Enzyme design. Structure first.
Site, PDB file in Angstrom:
ATOM      1  N   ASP A 332      17.116  56.298  47.774  1.00 55.49           N
ATOM      2  CA  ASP A 332      18.323  55.787  48.397  1.00 55.49           C
ATOM      3  C   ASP A 332      19.180  55.133  47.313  1.00 55.49           C
ATOM      4  O   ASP A 332      18.728  54.920  46.185  1.00 55.49           O
ATOM      5  CB  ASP A 332      17.961  54.841  49.547  1.00 55.49           C
ATOM      6  CG  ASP A 332      17.214  55.559  50.673  1.00 55.49           C
ATOM      7  OD1 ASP A 332      16.479  56.533  50.382  1.00 55.49           O
ATOM      8  OD2 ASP A 332      17.375  55.173  51.846  1.00 55.49           O
ATOM      9  N   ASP A 673      12.999  51.091  53.584  1.00 59.70           N
ATOM     10  CA  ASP A 673      13.140  49.656  53.809  1.00 59.70           C
ATOM     11  C   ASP A 673      13.082  49.169  55.255  1.00 59.70           C
ATOM     12  O   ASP A 673      12.711  48.004  55.457  1.00 59.70           O
ATOM     13  CB  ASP A 673      14.486  49.172  53.228  1.00 59.70           C
ATOM     14  CG  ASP A 673      15.664  49.975  53.754  1.00 59.70           C
ATOM     15  OD1 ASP A 673      15.511  51.206  53.902  1.00 59.70           O
ATOM     16  OD2 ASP A 673      16.737  49.386  54.023  1.00 59.70           O
ATOM     17  N   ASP A 677      12.359  54.023  59.140  1.00 58.96           N
ATOM     18  CA  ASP A 677      11.757  54.741  58.034  1.00 58.96           C
ATOM     19  C   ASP A 677      10.273  54.985  58.243  1.00 58.96           C
ATOM     20  O   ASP A 677       9.754  55.961  57.689  1.00 58.96           O
ATOM     21  CB  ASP A 677      11.980  53.997  56.717  1.00 58.96           C
ATOM     22  CG  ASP A 677      13.289  54.367  56.053  1.00 58.96           C
ATOM     23  OD1 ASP A 677      14.321  53.754  56.400  1.00 58.96           O
ATOM     24  OD2 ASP A 677      13.297  55.286  55.210  1.00 58.96           O
TER      25      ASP A 677
HETATM   26 MG   LIG Z   1      19.536  51.577  52.393  1.00 57.45          MG
END
Ligand SMILES: [Mg+2]
Ligand SMILES: C=C(/C=C\C[C@@H](O)[C@@H](O)[C@H](O)C/C=C/C=C\[C@@H](O)C[C@@H]1O[C@H](C[C@@H](O)[C@H](O)C[C@H]2O[C@H]([C@H](O)[C@H](O)CC[C@H](O)/C=C/[C@H](C)[C@@H](O)C[C@]3(O)O[C@H](C[C@@H](O)CCCCCCC[C@@]45C[C@@H](C)C[C@@](C)(O4)[C@@H](C[C@@H](C)CCCCC[C@@H](O)[C@H](O)[C@H](O)[C@@H](O)[C@H](O)[C@H]4O[C@H](C[C@H](O)[C@H](O)/C(C)=C/[C@H](O)C[C@@H](C)[C@H](O)C(=O)N/C=C/C(=O)NCCCO)[C@H](O)[C@@H](O)[C@@H]4O)O5)[C@H](O)[C@@H](O)[C@H]3O)C[C@@H](O)[C@@H]2O)[C@@H](O)[C@H](O)[C@H]1O)CC[C@H](O)[C@@H](O)[C@H](O)[C@H](C)C[C@H]1O[C@H](/C=C\[C@@H](O)[C@H](O)C[C@@H]2C[C@@H]3C[C@H](O2)[C@@H](CC[C@H]2O[C@H](CN)C[C@H]2O)O3)[C@@H](O)[C@H](O)[C@H]1O
Ligand SMILES: CCCCCCCC/C=C\CCCCCCCC(=O)OC[C@H](COP(=O)(O)OCC[N+](C)(C)C)OC(=O)CCCCCCC/C=C\CCCCCCCC
Ligand SMILES: CCCCCCCC/C=C\CCCCCCCC(=O)OC[C@H](COP(=O)(O)OCC[N+](C)(C)C)OC(=O)CCCCCCC/C=C\CCCCCCCC
Ligand SMILES: CCCCCCCC/C=C\CCCCCCCC(=O)OC[C@H](COP(=O)(O)OCC[N+](C)(C)C)OC(=O)CCCCCCC/C=C\CCCCCCCC
Ligand SMILES: CCCCCCCC/C=C\CCCCCCCC(=O)OC[C@H](COP(=O)(O)OCC[N+](C)(C)C)OC(=O)CCCCCCC/C=C\CCCCCCCC
Ligand SMILES: CCCCCCCC/C=C\CCCCCCCC(=O)OC[C@H](COP(=O)(O)OCC[N+](C)(C)C)OC(=O)CCCCCCC/C=C\CCCCCCCC
Ligand SMILES: CCCCCCCC/C=C\CCCCCCCC(=O)OC[C@H](COP(=O)(O)OCC[N+](C)(C)C)OC(=O)CCCCCCC/C=C\CCCCCCCC
Ligand SMILES: CC(C)CCC[C@@H](C)[C@H]1CC[C@H]2[C@@H]3CC=C4C[C@@H](O)CC[C@]4(C)[C@H]3CC[C@]12C
Ligand SMILES: CC(C)CCC[C@@H](C)[C@H]1CC[C@H]2[C@@H]3CC=C4C[C@@H](O)CC[C@]4(C)[C@H]3CC[C@]12C
Ligand SMILES: CC(C)CCC[C@@H](C)[C@H]1CC[C@H]2[C@@H]3CC=C4C[C@@H](O)CC[C@]4(C)[C@H]3CC[C@]12C
Ligand SMILES: Nc1ncnc2c1ncn2[C@@H]1O[C@H](COP(=O)(O)OP(=O)(O)O)[C@@H](O)[C@H]1O
Ligand code: NA
Ligand code: NA
Ligand code: NA
Ligand code: NA
Length: 979
Positions: A332, A673, A677
């Site tokens: 990311d 995070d 996810d």
């Molecule tokens: Mg992010």
């Protein structure tokens, strides 16, 4: 089934102020910490029995027994006996004991390093004491204090919910649930597991926030009483482990075969039925390797300690192996490639671009602070924002203090307090009635507040978000103060503004507001956040706000290293394609020269549809297109493109990308995070969870935890992961070579009928001297300057122990150490009178204590001990010839592709090993007394040099063997000898 008053009256607690710190500590010390207790275990008892009394040492325990009985029948019978048996027993016993101690020092060490990593990442809960919020280690929570939870955190103890806001929890682990059961302060079922007013231990809050009074703490919990069984627990075995075993199995098969064969050979040559079984037992014991698994576990544990120092904590040992084979990294942008230390740079309003950053003052001549539009924009930023300055910063400057909230809201709040004034009064001037929070699926934040105009009692609505979404919810534009429409002239000026602010590497947001008609929504009507109570569209756009966030320092080098390794990098971000493309241009994801379909359309001035999709190496796929796509199209983009960037993407999408990457046949690692996810973090091969900003969910669901949230940390970790492999192959290669010189003497002795070249004491000296310390030194080796300049590995096609290792060790290098020891043997005898031609067949006569008349070549007559002394001088010489040849084998083991002139002799432990072994041989051969006890005799000076030619030949051979590799890839040498 109680009330909030009855609950607070039973444990004692303020529903709005919580407990007092003094009272909290009084209870903390009164009933023990909120941590479960360790389970039963076997002490050193079963720990030592397996070490000193296992499977290979058992045979040695016999050698010791037998020998002692040989001394007893002697002293009881014969007058004036000998003592070779008593000292043999005293020596053998000392060997089983030491081997046990060394192994013990290793088994414990590993069991302790793993326990350390458990306290590296502890869990800290949010408790409210004396009316203040504090985050304390989960071990300091007591019964009675107030505890607040937030979606993504773990319920610390057994709570009694007192106030919730759409809070859901995952009750799957205790029982067998799946979907999120909502926790409400009201009671619903007689069964405590079914009611919603109780939070449980080890559960997680999926979405929402809640408050509660700790009812149960510590072992006095549900899963604590259940833990009676849990106590046992479970572990595992890495692939590598089940690879070693396999090998061990094959070898055992080869060994058992040869044993039976050596049996028929012995009887076809007239040995005693008993002598053939004695040979079968010895040969099978000498062919099966010993130590392999202990060195694999120790090497891994030591490497993990190396990785935790470089910011990469591993939840288990299987992760240490999977990290090296990494082919794709799905990372990311905000948090990994960047720092999340953003700052406003350019504001847009009144069709004009305005700069800012008045050097922590009111200078810089940015823009008239008087602008009407600016008042509206400064007000919405200051109002819709949810962050707040951390208490007690009244001293530091406006830019350097601490704030609590998103990085976007912090950059916004600081700009408004530096050149716009105190937000707390700005927030009370207008009262907040109802607020709806941000989300990645919505991509916008909105809230309604009262209007402080003493002449207008209407309602104000403000919202901020990605400029594209907000543009679709406006039909007017606040221009120069009044309103105007959004027609195409200013629509195009707004588009060129996005690329102006975007190309600068800056983050951009949109800000709009609207005056709700008090006739359709009076001052008394409550707009509960459920249905469309506010006009999403027809809003009034006031202006854009852009902010910079730089990349990490080490990041550019990390992407370069990935490109040289043969690793693909993908950026998954929630921003716009321009900002994505840009960050990509800077970090190195999109290197120079590669172009996209839009770039070619722009250069050629041709429609994008006409351009050939294969003509572009890199591409930027949006989110809407990704949603519309099927599976073959996804495979097309993943296979044909080299640098793929994904912009504007919800979390529910990451999984499709991962499934596409695995479909190809590649190992992937993903950085996560949040809560959405967890699914992705489990399907991938390496789940990298953020340490700084992650949530309990992301960490529980992943294999590794990044301690610093640095993209650069990862690539360094993969370097550490490949080195383990390289060193393991080197160490195994060094250990397996000495097998040939120890077995060939027992073979010529029985077949050729000559005097025994190697005995029992000397063999034990070889194993303990040249195979323990030099082997351990190899682990500590450095990395060759090719580690990152080489392709990843395919576990199916490339294994640790393959048919090539045995080719180099047994076949090529081994046979040479054997010839080197045979020369020192032949030389010692020829000089003392026994020549080589006369030696074939003398064994039968040699080993007979009664022939004191043995005649040598020069015709002299030898007694029994006079000839045994020369034989022992050969055992000692063999020994030294082995250490001498080991010198060479060890040097050549340091590198497998580069030379030692390139790699260098900077390893200190390996040197230590060369000097120390040499010392052991010189000491045992020359010390005044080893004669009586160990049976080693002094070596004359012209003998030490007999093994020198065989030691130089091994070194030169490996050096060329490598030159040919470096020059001709995929040749015959690499196909055959590269292990
Ligand atoms: Mg992010
Ligand atoms: C700890 C271990 C165990 C022991 C350790 C040991 O060493 C030591 O602790 C010592 O024990 C210390 C212990 C001490 C204990 C006590 C002592 O303190 C105290 C004192 O001890 C002293 C003794 C001590 O002084 C002794 O000397 C010590 C040594 O002992 C061993 C001796 O040699 C030997 O035992 C001497 C003892 C005696 O001789 C025993 C004789 C027999 C029991 C028996 O025969 C006698 C007798 O008959 O038994 C009767 C009882 C019967 O019920 C039994 C039933 C019999 C069953 C018959 C079936 C046979 C069978 C079986 C079938 C499966 C297959 C089959 C084919 O054969 C099949 C076929 C059938 C059809 C055959 C039928 C035959 C019939 C026979 C029977 O009927 C009976 O015989 C019959 O009933 C009789 O009654 C009758 O009389 C018969 O007589 C005749 C029979 C014949 O004889 C007989 O049949 C014969 C000949 C058969 C022949 O094979 C026939 C052939 C010719 C053939 O057929 C032939 O023609 N071929 C022709 C070919 C040809 O033309 N070719 C032409 C070509 C043309 O092209 C006649 O014919 C028959 O008709 C007649 O019926 O069926 C009954 O009681 C009596 O009758 C009795 O007399 C040897 C050692 O044990 C020991 O040194 C005492 O004197 C003293 O009083 C006491 O105080 C493990 C070992 C280690 O692991 C290993 O290392 C080992 O140490 C090494 C290997 C040592 C070697 O190396 C050493 C140096 C260094 C080594 O250490 C190194 O370490 C080596 C290492 C090894 C490995 C590899 C390498 O190198 C290293 C690498 C390792 C590295 O890698 C590692 C990584 N993992 C790291 C690192 O470690 O490790 C050397 O020093 C060693 O010397 C050396 O060996
Ligand atoms: C199981 C795996 C084993 C691995 C290595 C094992 C090492 C074993 C090496 C030797 C052991 C065999 C015993 C040697 C004794 C044989 C004696 C011999 O041979 O007496 C022939 C000649 C002596 O001539 P003279 O001057 O006395 O006659 C003078 C004549 N007048 C004066 C009348 C003119 O001796 C010569 O010529 C030179 C002979 C010296 C030794 C040669 C042995 C065979 C040659 C190479 C062996 C290495 C093979 C490597 C294979 C690698 C894969 C396994
Ligand atoms: C008392 C006991 C004493 C023991 C003495 C042992 C002496 C050693 C025994 C034999 C030595 C000769 C072995 C030669 C084998 C060829 C080695 C070779 O080909 O290496 C090639 C490398 C080139 O690597 P690169 O360009 O790819 O690196 C690139 C690095 N990057 C990537 C950073 C740019 O070259 C290099 O490193 C340059 C290194 C040059 C070293 C030359 C040594 C030869 C001189 C004398 C040899 C002895 C001859 C006969 C002696 C009998 C003695 C009594
Ligand atoms: C009579 C005949 C006997 C024949 C018997 C054969 C025996 C075995 C044959 C050969 C083995 C010995 C070969 C020694 C090799 C020396 C190579 C050397 O010199 O490569 C120079 C290096 C390179 O430097 P760089 O900065 O370019 O590397 C940059 C590295 N990058 C790029 C990663 C940053 O420099 C360095 O390694 C730094 C300086 C290190 C100096 C090491 C000196 C110690 C060498 C051996 C110790 C003796 C052990 C034996 C103990 C028994 C004694 C009784
Ligand atoms: C790293 C592991 C690798 C190798 C491990 C090997 C493990 C072996 C473990 C223990 C072995 C113990 C051996 C005991 C030494 C001898 C003891 C003994 O049974 O002796 C008996 C002899 C008596 O013989 P006799 O009357 O028949 O002679 C008649 C001579 N005629 C007649 C010709 C005049 O005694 C004498 O001769 C008196 C001489 C005494 C010898 C003193 C030497 C001290 C021995 C060991 C200490 C060294 C430790 C290393 C410290 C390093 C520090 C940095
Ligand atoms: C920076 C630190 C470096 C450390 C390197 C390792 C340190 C080496 C430590 C010691 C080596 C020196 C040994 C000297 C011993 C001389 C003692 C002696 O008095 O001995 C005489 C024997 C002659 O005996 P005989 O049978 O004629 O008489 C027998 C007469 N009876 C029996 C009747 C009495 O002569 C002999 O033993 C000859 C002795 C061997 C001659 C040495 C040749 C090696 C020279 C240099 C190589 C060093 C390696 C460095 C490589 C670096 C590469 C980069
Ligand atoms: C006490 C004694 C101490 C010193 C002893 C030294 C012994 C070591 C000497 C040589 C090491 C032997 C290494 C054996 C490797 C040779 C293998 C070979 O044949 O590989 C040929 C490769 C071809 O590869 P490719 O990919 O085209 O194959 C394509 C194959 N297909 C078409 C099937 C796909 O490479 C080529 O043809 C071109 C490369 C040719 C390299 C020749 C190297 C010669 C170097 C040193 C030898 C001279 C020593 C002089 C000393 C005098 C001592 C008295
Ligand atoms: C696989 C291993 C552990 C088996 C070890 C077997 C041992 C115990 C066997 C092997 C050969 C045997 C010896 C063979 C011959 C003799 C001579 C006899 O007059 C006394 C017993 C004695 C000395 C035997 C004692 C037992 C012995 C040493
Ligand atoms: C003690 C003595 C007599 C044993 C001699 C063993 C020799 C002949 C053995 C040791 C290791 C063996 C090699 C091990 C692996 C391979 C690879 C295979 O694809 C072809 C055979 C080949 C190349 C073997 C040939 C035979 C070999 C070289
Ligand atoms: C580079 C290569 C070709 C050099 C090979 C050199 C050979 C011929 C040399 C190397 C070491 C030498 C040996 C070294 C020591 C001794 C002991 C002595 O009491 C007799 C000679 C003898 C056994 C030597 C014979 C010749 C020898 C084997
Ligand atoms: N508090 C917020 N309110 C509204 N929009 C926001 C907020 N924070 C970020 N955004 C914007 O919403 C979009 C979604 O961001 P996000 O999903 O977090 O992607 P990223 O991980 O790249 O930040 C981005 O364009 C971002 O700039
Ligand atoms: Na061993
Ligand atoms: Na996984
Ligand atoms: Na070796
Ligand atoms: Na060994």
């Amino acid at each position: 089934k109680l009330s909030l008053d009855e609950l607070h009256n039973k444990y004692g607690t303020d529903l709005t102020r919580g407990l007092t710190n003094a009272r909290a500590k009084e209870i903390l010390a009164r009933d023990g910490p909120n941590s479960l207790t360790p389970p039963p275990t076997t002490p050193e008892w079963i720990k030592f029995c397996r070490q000193l009394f296992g499977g290979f040492s058992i045979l040695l325990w016999i050698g010791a027994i037998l020998c002692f009985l040989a001394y007893g029948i002697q002293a009881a019978t014969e007058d004036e006996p000998a003592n070779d048996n008593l000292y043999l027993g005293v020596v053998l016993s000392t060997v089983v004991i030491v081997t046990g101690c060394f192994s013990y020092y290793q088994e414990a060490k590993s069991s302790r390093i793993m326990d350390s990593f458990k306290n590296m990442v502890p869990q800290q809960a949010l408790v409210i004491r004396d009316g203040e919020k504090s985050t304390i280690n989960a071990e300091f929570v007591v019964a009675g204090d107030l505890v607040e939870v937030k979606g993504g955190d773990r319920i610390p103890a057994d709570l009694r919910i007192i106030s919730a806001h759409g809070c859901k929890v995952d009750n799957s682990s205790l029982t067998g649930e799946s979907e999120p059961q909502t926790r409400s302060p009201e009671f619903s079922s007689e069964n405590p597991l079914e009611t919603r007013n109780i939070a449980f231990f080890s559960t997680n809050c999926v979405e929402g926030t809640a408050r509660g009074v700790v009812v149960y703490t510590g072992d006095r919990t549900v899963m604590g009483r259940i833990a009676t069984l849990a106590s046992g627990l479970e572990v595992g075995r890495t692939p590598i482990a089940i690879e070693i075993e396999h090998f061990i199995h094959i070898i055992t098969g080869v060994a058992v075969f040869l044993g039976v064969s050596f049996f028929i050979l012995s009887l076809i040559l007239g040995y005693s039925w008993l002598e053939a079984v004695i040979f079968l037992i010895g040969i099978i014991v000498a062919n099966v390797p010993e130590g392999l698994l202990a060195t694999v576990t120790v090497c891994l544990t030591l490497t993990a300690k190396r990785m935790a120092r470089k910011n990469c904590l591993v939840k288990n040992l299987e992760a240490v192996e999977t990290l090296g084979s990494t082919s794709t990294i799905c990372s990311d942008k905000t948090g990994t490639l960047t720092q999340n230390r953003m700052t406003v740079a350019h504001m847009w309003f009144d069709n004009q671009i305005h700069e800012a950053d008045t050097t922590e003052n009111q200078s810089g001549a940015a823009f008239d602070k008087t602008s009407a539009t600016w008042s509206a924009l400064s007000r919405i930023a200051a109002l819709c924002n949810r962050a707040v300055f951390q208490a007690g910063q009244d001293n530091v400057p406006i830019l350097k203090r601490s704030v609590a909230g998103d990085a976007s809201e912090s950059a916004l709040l600081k700009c408004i307090e530096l050149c716009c004034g105190s937000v707390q009064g700005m927030r009370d001037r207008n009262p907040k009635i109802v607020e709806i929070p941000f989300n990645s699926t919505n991509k916008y934040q909105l809230s309604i507040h009262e209007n402080e105009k003493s002449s207008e009692s209407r309602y104000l609505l403000v919202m901020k978000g990605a400029p594209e979404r907000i543009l679709d919810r406006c039909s007017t534009i606040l221009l120069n103060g009044a309103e105007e429409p959004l027609k195409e002239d200013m629509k195009e000026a707004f588009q060129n503004a996005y690329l102006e602010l975007g190309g600068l590497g800056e983050r951009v947001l949109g800000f709009c507001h609207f005056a709700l008609p008090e006739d359709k929504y009076n001052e008394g009507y409550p707009f509960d956040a459920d249905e469309p109570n506010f006009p999403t569209t027809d809003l009034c756009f006031v202006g854009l706000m852009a902010m910079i966030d730089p990349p990490r320092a080490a990041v550019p080098d990390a992407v370069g290293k990935c490109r040289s390794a043969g690793i693909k990098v993908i950026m998954v971000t929630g921003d716009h394609p321009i900002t994505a493309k840009a960050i990509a241009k800077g970090v190195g994801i999109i290197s120079e020269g590669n172009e996209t379909i839009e770039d070619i359309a722009a250069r050629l001035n041709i429609p994008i549809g006409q351009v050939n999709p294969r003509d572009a190496k890199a591409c930027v796929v949006h989110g809407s297109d990704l949603k519309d796509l099927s599976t073959e199209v996804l495979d097309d983009i993943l296979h044909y493109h080299t640098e793929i960037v994904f912009a504007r993407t919800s979390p529910q999408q990451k999984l499709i990308i991962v499934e596409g990457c695995q479909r190809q046949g590649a190992i992937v690692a993903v950085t996560g995070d949040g809560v959405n996810d967890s699914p992705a973090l489990k399907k991938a091969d390496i789940g990298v969870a953020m340490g700084i900003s992650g949530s309990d969910v992301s960490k529980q669901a992943a294999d590794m935890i990044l301690l610093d949230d640095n993209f650069a940390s990862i690539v360094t970790g993969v370097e550490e992961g490949r080195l383990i492999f390289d060193n393991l192959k080197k160490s195994i290669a060094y250990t397996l070579t000495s097998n040939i010189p120890e077995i060939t003497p027992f073979l010529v002795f029985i077949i050729g009928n000559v005097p025994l070249p190697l005995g029992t004491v000397t063999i034990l000296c070889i194993d303990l001297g040249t195979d323990m310390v030099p082997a351990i030194s190899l682990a500590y080796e450095q990395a060759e300057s090719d580690i990152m300049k080489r392709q990843p590995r395919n576990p199916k096609t490339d294994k640790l122990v393959n048919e090539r290792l045995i080719s180099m060790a047994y076949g090529q290098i081994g046979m040479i150490q054997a010839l080197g020891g045979f020369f020192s043997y032949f030389v010692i005898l020829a000089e003392n009178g026994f020549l080589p031609m006369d030696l074939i067949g003398k064994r039968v006569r040699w080993d007979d204590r009664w022939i004191s008349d043995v005649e040598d070549s020069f015709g002299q007559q030898w007694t029994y001990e006079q000839r045994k002394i020369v034989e022992f001088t050969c055992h000692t010489s063999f020994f030294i010839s082995i250490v001498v040849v080991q010198w060479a084998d060890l040097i050549i083991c340091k590198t497998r592709r580069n030379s030692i002139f390139q790699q260098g002799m900077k390893n200190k432990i390996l040197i230590f090993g060369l000097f120390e072994e040499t010392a052991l041989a010189a000491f045992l051969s020359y010390c005044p007394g080893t004669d009586v006890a160990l049976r080693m005799y002094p070596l004359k000076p012209s003998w030490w040099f007999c093994a020198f030619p065989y030691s130089l030949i091994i070194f030169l051979y490996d050096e060329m063997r490598r030159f040919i590799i470096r020059r001709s890839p995929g040749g015959w040498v690499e196909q055959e000898t590269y292990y």
